[PDB]
Amino acid sequence: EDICFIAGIGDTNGYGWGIAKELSKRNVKIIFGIWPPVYNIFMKNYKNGKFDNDMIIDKDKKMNILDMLPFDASFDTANDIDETKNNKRYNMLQNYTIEDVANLIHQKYGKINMLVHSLANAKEVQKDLLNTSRKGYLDALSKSSYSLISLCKYFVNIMKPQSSIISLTYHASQKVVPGYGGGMSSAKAALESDTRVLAYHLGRNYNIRINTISAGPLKSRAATAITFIDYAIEYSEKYAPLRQKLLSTDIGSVASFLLSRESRAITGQTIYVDNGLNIMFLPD
Amino acid sequence: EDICFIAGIGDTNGYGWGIAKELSKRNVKIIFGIWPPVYNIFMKNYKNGKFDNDMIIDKDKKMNILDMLPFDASFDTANDIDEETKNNKRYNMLQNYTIEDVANLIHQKYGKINMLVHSLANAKEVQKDLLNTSRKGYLDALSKSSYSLISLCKYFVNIMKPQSSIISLTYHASQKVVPGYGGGMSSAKAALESDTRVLAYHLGRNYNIRINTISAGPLKSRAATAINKTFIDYAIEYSEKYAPLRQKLLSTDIGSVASFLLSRESRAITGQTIYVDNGLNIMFLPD
């Protein structure tokens, strides 16, 4: 059978959940990587049934969640954790670095064949690029971009040949969006470029594919935290070629396709799933 | 149940067949629009079972083709057909083959459809480089390979349901230099990709109809062979040696991507150029 690890789920309002739902229609087994500071909250909500409606796929099936594990994209191996190891919210957790989660998944379930990067962070996202500190900019690149490379480096060993990987990006990398601050734009630019270079190395060495989905705006918790997202949604719904509301499951079905054998000849691409908004220059 | 019109199938060796095959696999009904110069040949081979093996999808599934119609994308309406073509040996027996007439025929026979495939190209001077292409040659390339998409859309939107989907096929020579891709074919593909955007805007807003284009890698189709003065053998060998994915690119690889874009699974995607080429487009320097 097929197993997908999804790194970057904090709740049911994001793209990670949508991707999980859609993969579920194809009977893919799902493992969630959850950022430790919100891990116990998530587990609490889940156990309390808060996500039950959200887990419903169709009349016949609910989402098959194989496992849920703490996962922090800041840390490559156990050797990289600063203190933090004993922070209030990290202390009762273990094995949450990228390599540790890879070893854990492999130990419990064997090899997987789908990998989803669905996470971003930037401590200074509220500042515009020109007022971003070095520390802030590098945090953004570290968490939003390098984490993709690191995820690939540790997970290829536990993947099958002809496996497939995706991440999520945003058009601010290619065209200016004021409000998308703190080096987030820069991080998505690196991410899209890295997707190509990784596609070369993964393709030639392992026959593994990798692509990125450039999504349109979604009112996820993180987006709301940057409002900017309300403007972006209102603007997209007024001016995109397609005026339907953009759903997380619209990204999910594209992700589902890029992660399956049906897209076997697609790699290294940035695929726009945004109701066509990226193609517009002058709003009518 | 889904119905797709595929414009530009002349045999089992091009991308059109690969697209048909992948669609039938998902139980989409398929209508072939076939250029009149090859129409009788195709029908005959079909009736004689020459395509039987190629129609084998897998171990216990075979393609079903709903219909096969003469179709010439050079002509918008019956009034556009010049006297010479109308009376030509290969056209004189055929009817309803203009873009307007085939849409009308399809609608009358089957009602509204929901998928449309543009899988054709033509260019009289493809063997010349751009600088040595005549005005007539260039405009022929644009007319046949690019305008034909606009016209197909203009007439087929009235016989398509909302939420329907359209695709065409392009090539990376539009965006980066491929010296042997002559005769204004490069220009035509540039225009096709740009028109795909503008059309996505008009069709999206007014019809809730989506349109995209697939930039395919090289395939040894009958038409690809006509390029050399081979060009396609070089392109294929180069692709298999240098792409991130080093495996033979198949027509059905394009076909399954086409199927995805034609389906509701891709409802938030429109106006896009999607590359299906084993990743070759992302390379700068061959290692």
Ligand SMILES: NC(=O)c1ccc[n+]([C@@H]2O[C@H](COP(=O)([O-])OP(=O)(O)OC[C@H]3O[C@@H](n4cnc5c(N)ncnc54)[C@H](O)[C@@H]3O)[C@@H](O)[C@H]2O)c1
């Ligand atoms: N919301 C949008 O409009 C939008 C648009 C385009 C792309 N995206 C991308 O989609 C992805 C998901 O974003 P979302 O909008 O669904 O937000 P989200 O809140 O659903 O998810 C982002 C997740 O990343 C997790 N995360 C943050 N730092 C982490 C770390 N250090 N280690 C592990 N996990 C960490 C968060 O807990 C959060 O759950 C992101 O890559 C984002 O850039 C979002």
Ligand SMILES: NC(=O)c1ccc[n+]([C@@H]2O[C@H](COP(=O)([O-])OP(=O)(O)OC[C@H]3O[C@@H](n4cnc5c(N)ncnc54)[C@H](O)[C@@H]3O)[C@@H](O)[C@H]2O)c1
């Ligand atoms: N073969 C490749 O390496 C390659 C690469 C990228 C893109 N493409 C594109 O894919 C599409 C299909 O090409 P192919 O290589 O599969 O060749 P093909 O020979 O299979 O298809 C071209 C078809 O178009 C038909 N045609 C030409 N002019 C027509 C007209 N006036 N009206 C109706 N039909 C007409 C021909 O009969 C032929 O069957 C074309 O758009 C081509 O540019 C091909």
Ligand SMILES: Cc1cc(=O)oc2cc(Oc3ccc(Cl)cc3O)ccc12
């Ligand atoms: C700063 C930050 C933290 C986090 O956890 O997720 C994030 C997810 C983020 O996702 C986005 C939201 C809206 C848009 Cl339009 C694009 C996005 O990339 C951004 C920023 C963060």
Ligand SMILES: Cc1cc(=O)oc2cc(Oc3ccc(Cl)cc3O)ccc12
């Ligand atoms: C001139 C011409 C006539 C025709 O019927 O089909 C064509 C199909 C063509 O398809 C291609 C083949 C190879 C490559 Cl690499 C790209 C293509 O666009 C080109 C040109 C023609």
